[PDB]
Amino acid sequence: QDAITAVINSADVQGKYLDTAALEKLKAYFSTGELRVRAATTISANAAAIVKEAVAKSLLYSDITRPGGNMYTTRRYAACIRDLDYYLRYATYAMLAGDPSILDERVLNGLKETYNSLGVPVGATVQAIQAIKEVTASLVGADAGKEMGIYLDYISSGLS
Amino acid sequence: QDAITAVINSADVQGKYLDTAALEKLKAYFSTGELRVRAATTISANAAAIVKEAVAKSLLYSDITRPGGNMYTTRRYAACIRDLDYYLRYATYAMLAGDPSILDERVLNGLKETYNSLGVPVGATVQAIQAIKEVTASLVGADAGKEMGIYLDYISSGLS
Amino acid sequence: ALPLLQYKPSSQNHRVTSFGAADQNEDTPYIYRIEDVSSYTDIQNIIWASYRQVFSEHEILKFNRQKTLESQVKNGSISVRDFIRGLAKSEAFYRLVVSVNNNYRLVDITLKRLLGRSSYNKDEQIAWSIVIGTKGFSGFVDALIDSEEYTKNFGENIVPYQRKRMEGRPHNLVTPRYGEDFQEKAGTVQTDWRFTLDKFYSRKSQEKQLREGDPRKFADLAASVGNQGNYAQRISAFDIDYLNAVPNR
Amino acid sequence: IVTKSIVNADAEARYLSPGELDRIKSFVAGGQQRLRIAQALTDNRERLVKQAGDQLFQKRPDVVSPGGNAYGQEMTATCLRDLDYYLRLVTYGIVAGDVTPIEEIGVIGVREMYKSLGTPIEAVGEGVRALKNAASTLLSAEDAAEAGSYFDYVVGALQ
Amino acid sequence: IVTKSIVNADAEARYLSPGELDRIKSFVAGGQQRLRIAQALTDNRERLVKQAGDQLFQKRPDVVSPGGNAYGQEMTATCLRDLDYYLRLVTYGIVAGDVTPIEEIGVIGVREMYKSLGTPIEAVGEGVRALKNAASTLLSAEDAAEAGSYFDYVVGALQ
Amino acid sequence: TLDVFTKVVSQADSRGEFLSNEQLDALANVVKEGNKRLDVVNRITSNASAIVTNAARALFEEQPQLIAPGGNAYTNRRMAACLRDMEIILRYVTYAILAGDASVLDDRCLNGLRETYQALGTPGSSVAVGVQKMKDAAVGIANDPNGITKGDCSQLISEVASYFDRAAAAVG
Amino acid sequence: TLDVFTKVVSQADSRGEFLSNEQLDALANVVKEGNKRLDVVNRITSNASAIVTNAARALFEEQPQLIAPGGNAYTNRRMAACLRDMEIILRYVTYAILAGDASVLDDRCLNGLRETYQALGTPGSSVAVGVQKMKDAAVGIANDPNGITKGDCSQLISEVASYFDRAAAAVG
Amino acid sequence: VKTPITEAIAAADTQGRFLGNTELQSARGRYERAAASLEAARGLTSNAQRLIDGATQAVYQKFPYTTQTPGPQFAADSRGKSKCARDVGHYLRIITYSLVAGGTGPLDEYLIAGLAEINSTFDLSPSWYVEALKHIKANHGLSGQAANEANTYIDYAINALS
Amino acid sequence: VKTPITEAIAAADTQGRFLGNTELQSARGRYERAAASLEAARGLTSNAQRLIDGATQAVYQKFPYTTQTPGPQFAADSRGKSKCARDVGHYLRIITYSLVAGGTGPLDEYLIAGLAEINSTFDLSPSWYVEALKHIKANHGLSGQAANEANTYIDYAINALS
Ligand SMILES: CCC1=C(C)/C(=C/C2=NC(=C\c3[nH]c(/C=C4\NC(=O)[C@H](C)[C@H]4CC)c(C)c3CCC(=O)O)/C(CCC(=O)O)=C2C)NC1=O
Ligand SMILES: CCC1=C(C)/C(=C/C2=NC(=C\c3[nH]c(/C=C4\NC(=O)[C@H](C)[C@H]4CC)c(C)c3CCC(=O)O)/C(CCC(=O)O)=C2C)NC1=O
Ligand SMILES: CCC1=C(C)/C(=C/C2=NC(=C\c3[nH]c(/C=C4\NC(=O)[C@H](C)[C@H]4CC)c(C)c3CCC(=O)O)/C(CCC(=O)O)=C2C)NC1=O
Ligand SMILES: CCC1=C(C)/C(=C/C2=NC(=C\c3[nH]c(/C=C4\NC(=O)[C@H](C)[C@H]4CC)c(C)c3CCC(=O)O)/C(CCC(=O)O)=C2C)NC1=O
Ligand SMILES: CCC1=C(C)/C(=C/C2=NC(=C\c3[nH]c(/C=C4\NC(=O)[C@H](C)[C@H]4CC)c(C)c3CCC(=O)O)/C(CCC(=O)O)=C2C)NC1=O
Ligand SMILES: CCC1=C(C)/C(=C/C2=NC(=C\c3[nH]c(/C=C4\NC(=O)[C@H](C)[C@H]4CC)c(C)c3CCC(=O)O)/C(CCC(=O)O)=C2C)NC1=O
Ligand SMILES: CCC1=C(C)/C(=C/C2=NC(=C\c3[nH]c(/C=C4\NC(=O)[C@H](C)[C@H]4CC)c(C)c3CCC(=O)O)/C(CCC(=O)O)=C2C)NC1=O
Ligand SMILES: CCC1=C(C)/C(=C/C2=NC(=C\c3[nH]c(/C=C4\NC(=O)[C@H](C)[C@H]4CC)c(C)c3CCC(=O)O)/C(CCC(=O)O)=C2C)NC1=O
Ligand SMILES: CCC1=C(C)/C(=C/C2=NC(=C\c3[nH]c(/C=C4\NC(=O)[C@H](C)[C@H]4CC)c(C)c3CCC(=O)O)/C(CCC(=O)O)=C2C)NC1=O
Ligand SMILES: CCC1=C(C)/C(=C/C2=NC(=C\c3[nH]c(/C=C4\NC(=O)[C@H](C)[C@H]4CC)c(C)c3CCC(=O)O)/C(CCC(=O)O)=C2C)NC1=O
Ligand SMILES: CCC1=C(C)/C(=C/C2=NC(=C\c3[nH]c(/C=C4\NC(=O)[C@H](C)[C@H]4CC)c(C)c3CCC(=O)O)/C(CCC(=O)O)=C2C)NC1=O
């Protein structure tokens, strides 16, 4: 769903026409879409650098990459990079849509089930998503970093 | 957690002493605590009036209070008032702490699970929290209404 | 500017002679005349009964009364026909009737008060409603008192009155200063709870009470649309000749 | 139109390509004209349903005829309510910029619905054509073009 | 943007949408400015490529180190030719509006290629980022946003 | 006859309370935008006679049987009848923009209009095709800036056009 | 009904020339002196009912046979008759100060008033003893140095008192 | 009802002509004063409860017999004092109503229309209400040109009383 | 005759009441526009002779047959051209008269009253005079708010012509 599609749905289930508050919501979305698109472009620029800096901030040189940790095996390191790239990409989609429903529908659906099945540590994942959020808020600026951090904190809060 | 306790924790997990950036953060918190306390006092003044005005703005005279809606039964109306009072009270706690972690720990933990279990409409709850935010930003002023709306929008974003 | 469209006059009481003077009842009004002065009681009665026709008794009050036009009437400087023009083209009368009523109902309410006759049909009310619009209200009140039905029946110096209502209700009583379509705007039927009980079960509330959806909401739109379809063809199916009906190429 | 590009780049493992970002920026720019067109179609709804019923019942009198479906005041009120629904979905598609939230509610299963209701679909298409003509008379040239866009989509969809 | 719209409406059974026709109209309206940007980038080919390559060697001296790939005059000439090729593909993408010319000429199989050539991918990407910065400094401001966002696609797709 | 100033009194009398401070901040914006309102009004009345015939170049050209023999705008008095009250629409719409509320317009201009227009035999729907053609020319004049200081009167333009849409709804 | 603005038009029409520049400099002082007229005018009308009874007591206390049995102010409607038109002097003098020229005063209080006052038998000279008592109270209120700001109202005060002297001359 | 914007309309409507510059000019004048008139409305609304009980105990001073004489009309009984603050509190409403309207219309239509009829029947002497309004116009604490603004409409109710 | 000071009087006189604040509001309002209206009077009086012969030769341009057709009504010989500058010169007088009066009164009473009667009898087409007044409103050289001021009354004479 969108913010546009959410506004249209909320006006639809009442049978209501588009009143002035919904037009205010759509015009606010059409105002913010500029920096939304520019932020999505520069996040699509260097996603690999963001994931590299995030694991170098949070996960590297810990016991997690040591033997016994969950990132010791090299296929598990590759799976870690894959999961962080997923979090960043779906946070980019939720930032450009302006509605976190795609995070609820595609990422946060059965994810705690999987992470408790595999024995994946949840707190280290939350700290890695936090480091992702700090790196991309530094990279994109504060004004779009707020909206990026909202959906990354949404993923972090639903994960916990 | 606090903003003080978050600064102390972020300095602690590195083994770092209190450097000048952390002292800047604590001194900014000690500057803003004045209007934090005054805002918390006047929100504790008339919380019932805020909840009444919010349901009169958003939820009343809709289909939600009509039969078939989720607020038709009078125990469900009382549960609605209880949930809105919870959102306002925990937003007051997060405003005075200056850190949204208590919202993540006490409100937003298993709340989407409950609201999808009971069949509670989520979008009407988001619009009710929005009306709460507008009423208390009018009541407290713009300067503390920004910080109140930050945590109320945090509840709204985590709920969605 | 443009002349009056011709409207049909319905048969009413006052188009008839009613012969004689010594024969009519008591209940014909007192035909108060400024030429009859003889006292101040006749002078005060002429002023008060001229307010009676214009403001329907209750309003005369104190404030509404224009004291300078009554100042003048005693002197005799201005005729009674001129004096009704002062009461009718007065904004104490504008706020009371003219703003409040409609151009179609104003024609009905000022003929009963200045000419003393009800309008014949709706076509007469339709006819003068244009003369209100382009000339203004005081231009139309001027046209009523200049009119030859006024001067023939009342004259220059006689207060108006209902002509020949042998078996009819009195005109200040049957007609208020505002009707039912305007009643919510000047009256207080919105805030009185006695009337909301009657509108509670009114057929108009049931059209409001229904939720979004149902074709009963669009039932008023369906009557305005019209466009009924044609009936089936009268020609029988045996006269079709389907084998030779097909055109080649 | 943002959900379209998002699921479009989401089926792929790639990000949103910046040409899609350009089309989102251009739609964001045109959103104000979209909102004015939607409000102009919003406030004048009953005129459009009146003129659509006018032109339809002048065009096809069989719905008026008693063998047709829209016979009587109740059935003709349901008919104009259907035209009201389609005008509402057209305003939704005008705001959304792409025909997904109007096809999801009015197009995707309409043929079997109108088949098991007895009504012909061609008369509904003529009704949306009459709505397009009345809105073309109501709007300016660059507004009627952009409204006749989505009206044209509905007319092509009902056939 | 015409090819992508046509193949997207080809995957469905339907025609081109009114939204998509608005996209084509806006692309035609911006096409002359895109030809101006292509004019500037064509005429600034030399100094943009040389400044970007020398910015790369300032950032990454590993390639021109004797253990690196771009050691020697001929190898560094081929390095600058690779940057020339990528700037040419960026101009093609700015003109077309799609990134399908950039993709199917220089993106789609470049990882396996530069793996077999021994060349690091990230230094290519840093050189195209230097091209983005140089062409951003040459052009007008929001025009540079347009050019640098196609450059941004190339940079993100190389890594 | 009501206003923006007097209608926010009249509902405030019905509830019987003093006027709130946010109603006075609302009326302070009404005074603030008053100068803009006046300028729009003077341009309509100065081009008042130019609008009516330019609407009559299309009100009769689009439905040409009306002046052709048989139509209700055929003879000359009948033709001068739909110019004697095409302007009365403009006479009361300009009163509505001056007062700022459509309550003045409703009482006289449209209260009995739809009743006479089936009593006479005139097409009621053939009025509101051309009152829309007045609105297309009225907001074109009121928005255009000629010898005027630059300003934004967009809000007035939309609710100037709302008065024409109310003027077309109760006739059609 | 004439003005200061309209009377300098009306003689300028009779000679048929354009308005001279020193007439426009004269009217520019009238606009400049315009604010003072309103201030003087509002104080008279706000103390309008307080003047008449205060003026009135002197009017009857000085000539005490008038309300004593036999005088023309004796009975009660006769007494209310010289309060119903003691104020009409103030009703038209305030119109004269508003217009700034006594040409609206001389059609209502000065035109036929001396004719009715002979036929009526009411003393005519016993009016102008008390219209002077109104002027003594009118210029005392208009010239009081209370509130507002200090300014020169002397020119207005003298030709405010000239309107009362014209109001007393055509009755006596 | 009487308003300078309304008075421009009803003058131009009875002539059947458009809005000239003479009706339009009148509207322009109202705005300059309406900026200072809304200053006078907030000065009376904020000090409303001080002014009512400031007034209804000032009338008891000059007329001490009104709290002593046993009569339906008299305010000596508590029920009269309950109807005291109702009536004087009705005056400050209509004064504040005629402030923001700019004209005397709401004062002319709600308060003083037919006031001589009602005060004769219920024997309410109008010397009582004029004593309360003199207390209001001296104790509102308003200053500047806004102090002139409330002072006209209070004094306009005074002259209509007597 | 129609003037905002007069319109306050004739409204309050027909009611038989005093001057309220609603009649008295207009006078205050009128002075502010009258300060900019007298600016427009000097702009037309000083440029009077340029504007008349600027106008009466502009109407000869758009209507060249008016100097050619032999008729008493047409301006063929010098006697029509002598009555040309009289008639167009009469218009700038009344426009300047209605400027300083503030209302449309002198324009309503001297110029446009009974203009449809006279133009039908002498066959003077009113399309001639409206062509001269469009030349005046574009070539007076006035600026600012005073340029708006003359532009209303010129356009008010235009609508009364047609
Ligand atoms: C789009 C949303 C989405 C997510 C997130 C997802 C995750 C996901 N992570 C997995 C494994 C894994 N996930 C992790 C990740 C972590 N472990 C740690 O220590 C770190 C805290 C964290 C990385 C930041 C690791 C190490 C494995 C390897 C377990 C294994 O395969 O043996 C698996 C098992 C199979 C596979 O990777 O291919 C799934 C399905 N699937 C999804 O569809
Ligand atoms: C401190 C954080 C916190 C929250 C929010 C919370 C909510 C909560 N809301 C509940 C029910 C409910 N919650 C709602 C609320 C709503 N439904 C609507 O239609 C509106 C959109 C919305 C009100 C704004 C209603 C109507 C029920 C009644 C369901 C029922 O009991 O039958 C229940 C079920 C049992 C009970 O109320 O006593 C819980 C636990 N518990 C918590 O600990
Ligand atoms: C120009 C069209 C026109 C007509 C016809 C008309 C009739 C009319 N007939 C009347 C009375 C009357 N009409 C009759 C008539 C009759 N009695 C009988 O037995 C016969 C059957 C019948 C006559 C043939 C009677 C008896 C009265 C007096 C009834 C009463 O006063 O109770 C009256 C009331 C008194 C009056 O004459 O003013 C009117 C107005 N007015 C009009 O403007
Ligand atoms: C917003 C998406 C949506 C659509 C499309 C929709 C269609 C719809 N059309 C219906 C009936 C109807 N629809 C029509 C339609 C027509 N009259 C004609 O002759 C033409 C063929 C056509 C319109 C001009 C008629 C005549 C009925 C009543 C048929 C019956 O009662 O059996 C009904 C059943 C009655 C009702 O509950 O309204 C539905 C659900 N409902 C929806 O919620
Ligand atoms: C239009 C799409 C396209 C590309 C991209 C392309 C690249 C390309 N690069 C080559 C070599 C090369 N490419 C580089 C590149 C680099 N030096 C570095 O360290 C940097 C990371 C990078 C500069 C960006 C070097 C050093 C060689 C020489 C390697 C050799 O000769 O073995 C060659 C083989 C020799 C040749 O034919 O020129 C090809 C085909 N060809 C194409 O048709
Ligand atoms: C102040 C509000 C107001 C309005 C608007 C109004 C209209 C109105 N128009 C009328 C006639 C008319 N109305 C029209 C107008 C039209 N007919 C056409 O052919 C055209 C389609 C259309 C104009 C666009 C015509 C030509 C007449 C004369 C018809 C006749 O004489 O039969 C009549 C009946 C006769 C009349 O007095 O002139 C009224 C009452 N009256 C009012 O009080
Ligand atoms: C009753 C006689 C009268 C008129 C006519 C009048 C108009 C008038 N319009 C003004 C301003 C203005 N008027 C407009 C109007 C507009 N600008 C646009 O671009 C829009 C299209 C349009 C509105 C639709 C604007 C923008 C201003 C700027 C100044 C202000 O805000 O007042 C001002 C400010 C003061 C001045 O200009 O000297 C005046 C005088 N004042 C008067 O006393
Ligand atoms: C010195 C104390 C005193 C006063 C004040 C007085 C006034 C006075 N004015 C009278 C009449 C009158 N007064 C007026 C005056 C006017 N009517 C208008 O409409 C005009 C606007 C206005 C003049 C400008 C008129 C018209 C009459 C009629 C009777 C008459 O001619 O005397 C009469 C006749 C007898 C009576 O009314 O009982 C009295 C007493 N008599 C006195 O002894
Ligand atoms: C005692 C001798 C005396 C008088 C008479 C006097 C009056 C007076 N009234 C003034 C202002 C004013 N007077 C008014 C009065 C009004 N405007 C309206 O539109 C209302 C209808 C009316 C009130 C009811 C206004 C609006 C002003 C504007 C300037 C100000 O606020 O003082 C000023 C300001 C300074 C000046 O004008 O030079 C003076 C002098 N000053 C004096 O020294
Ligand atoms: C909205 C404007 C408005 C006002 C202000 C108003 C006043 C008003 N006060 C009345 C009576 C009254 N008025 C008072 C007030 C007073 N008497 C005293 O002794 C005190 C001196 C004084 C108060 C300070 C009392 C005590 C009554 C009842 C007298 C009776 O019943 O005879 C009455 C007659 C009976 C009634 O309905 O209650 C009216 C009409 N009416 C209105 O429509
Ligand atoms: C004070 C305001 C005022 C004006 C302006 C006015 C004009 C006016 N011009 C007239 C004739 C005329 N008007 C003109 C003027 C013109 N004809 C042309 O050919 C030219 C196009 C045009 C001049 C530019 C002429 C030539 C006559 C004489 C026509 C005749 O005698 O039939 C007449 C009728 C006969 C007359 O007394 O002379 C009037 C009343 N009257 C007024 O009271």
UniProtKB/Swiss-Prot annotation, chain C:
Q: What are the residue boundaries of the PBS-linker domain, all occurrences included?
A: 10-190
Give a Gene Ontology cellular component term annotated to this protein: plasma membrane-derived thylakoid membrane
Matches recorded under InterPro entries: PBS_linker_dom (IPR001297), PBS_linker_sf (IPR038255)
Record GO biological process: photosynthesis
Give yes or no: UniProt keyword Thylakoid: yes
Instruction: Provide the disulphide bond pattern.
Output: none
Where's it found, cell-wise?
Answer: Cellular thylakoid membrane
Q: How does the UniProt record describe the way this protein sits in the membrane?
A: Peripheral membrane protein
The cross-references to Pfam families, in alphabetical order and at most eight, read: PBS_linker_poly
Q: Which UniProt keywords apply?
A: Antenna complex, Membrane, Photosynthesis, Phycobilisome, Thylakoid
Q: Which domain of life is it from?
A: Bacteria
**What's the main place this protein lives?**
membrane
**Keyword set includes Transferase:** no
The similarity comment for this entry is: Belongs to the phycobilisome linker protein family.
Q: What does this protein do?
A: Rod-core linker protein required for attachment of phycocyanin to allophycocyanin in cores of phycobilisomes.
What does the record note on quaternary structure? Part of the phycobilisome, a hemidiscoidal structure that is composed of two distinct substructures: a core complex and a number of rods radiating from the core.
Show the PANTHER family listed in the entry: PHYCOBILISOME 32.1 KDA LINKER POLYPEPTIDE, PHYCOCYANIN-ASSOCIATED, ROD 2-RELATED
What protein is this chain from? Phycobilisome rod-core linker polypeptide CpcG4
- Originating organism: Nostoc sp. (strain PCC 7120 / SAG 25.82 / UTEX 2576)
Swiss-Prot record, chains D, E:
Q: How is the protein modified post-translationally, according to the record?
A: Contains one covalently linked phycocyanobilin chromophore. The chromophore is added by phycocyanobilin lyase CpcS 1.
Main localisation:
membrane
Where is the protein found, in the record's own terms?
A: Cellular thylakoid membrane
Q: Which UniProt keywords apply?
A: Antenna complex, Bile pigment, Chromophore, Electron transport, Membrane, Methylation, Photosynthesis, Phycobilisome, Thylakoid, Transport
Q: How is the subunit organization of this protein annotated in UniProt?
A: Heterohexamer of two alpha chains, one alpha-B chain and three beta chains.
Q: Which family does it belong to?
A: Belongs to the phycobiliprotein family.
Phylogenetic classification of the source organism? Bacteria, Bacillati, Cyanobacteriota, Cyanophyceae, Nostocales
> Species name for this entry?
Nostoc sp. (strain PCC 7120 / SAG 25.82 / UTEX 2576)
InterPro entries for the chain = Globin-like_sf, Phycobilisome_asu/bsu, Phycobilisome_asu/bsu_sf
The processes (GO biological process) annotated in the record are: photosynthesis
Q: Name one GO cellular component term.
A: plasma membrane-derived thylakoid membrane
Q: Output the CDD domains linked to this UniProt entry.
A: APC_alpha
Q: Where does (2R,3E)-phycocyanobilin bind?
A: 79
Protein's job: Light-harvesting photosynthetic bile pigment-protein from the phycobiliprotein complex. Allophycocyanin has a maximum absorption at approximately 650 to 653 nanometers.
Protein name per its UniProtKB record: Allophycocyanin subunit alpha 1
Annotated positions of the N4-methylasparagine modification: 69
* Membrane topology type: Peripheral membrane protein
Query: Is Secreted given among the entry's keywords?
Result: no
UniProtKB/Swiss-Prot annotation, chains F, G:
Q: Which GO terms describe its biological process?
A: photosynthesis
**Job of this protein:** Light-harvesting photosynthetic bile pigment-protein from the phycobiliprotein complex (phycobilisome, PBS). Phycocyanin is the major phycobiliprotein in the PBS rod.
Binding residues annotated for (2R,3E)-phycocyanobilin 1, in chain numbering? 82
UniProt key word Transmembrane helix: no
Q: Fetch the Gene3D superfamilies from UniProt.
A: Phycocyanins
Q: Does Zinc appear among the keywords? A: no
Record protein name field: C-phycocyanin beta subunit
Membrane topology term: Peripheral membrane protein
The record's comment on protein family reads: Belongs to the phycobiliprotein family.
Keyword list (alphabetical) reads: Antenna complex, Bile pigment, Chromophore, Electron transport, Membrane, Methylation, Photosynthesis, Phycobilisome, Thylakoid, Transport
Swiss-Prot record, chains H, I:
Membrane topology of this protein = Peripheral membrane protein
PTM comment, free text: Contains one covalently linked phycocyanobilin chromophore.
Cite the binding residues for (2R,3E)-phycocyanobilin.
84
Work out whether the entry's keyword set contains Nucleotidyltransferase: no
- SUPFAM superfamilies, per this entry? Globin-like
Q: Which UniProt keywords apply?
A: Antenna complex, Bile pigment, Chromophore, Electron transport, Membrane, Photosynthesis, Phycobilisome, Thylakoid, Transport
Q: What CDD domains is this protein classified in? A: PC-PEC_alpha
Show the stretches that span the lipid bilayer: none
Record flagged with keyword Electron transport: yes
Please give the GO cellular component terms listed in this UniProt entry.
phycobilisome; plasma membrane-derived thylakoid membrane
Q: Name one GO biological process term.
A: photosynthesis
UniProt subcellular location? Cellular thylakoid membrane
Q: Sorted alphabetically, which NCBIfam families does this protein's record hold?
A: phycocy_alpha
Q: Which family does it belong to?
A: Belongs to the phycobiliprotein family.
PANTHER family in the record: C-PHYCOCYANIN ALPHA SUBUNIT, PHYCOBILISOME 32.1 KDA LINKER POLYPEPTIDE, PHYCOCYANIN-ASSOCIATED, ROD 2-RELATED
Function of the molecule: Light-harvesting photosynthetic bile pigment-protein from the phycobiliprotein complex (phycobilisome, PBS). Phycocyanin is the major phycobiliprotein in the PBS rod.
Subunit structure, as described in the record: Heterodimer of an alpha and a beta chain, which further assembles into trimers and the trimers into hexamers. Part of 2 PBS rod complexes, the conventional PBS rod and a photosystem I-specific CpcL-PBS rod.
Q: What name does this protein carry? A: C-phycocyanin alpha subunit
Q: Which organism is it from?
A: Nostoc sp. (strain PCC 7120 / SAG 25.82 / UTEX 2576)
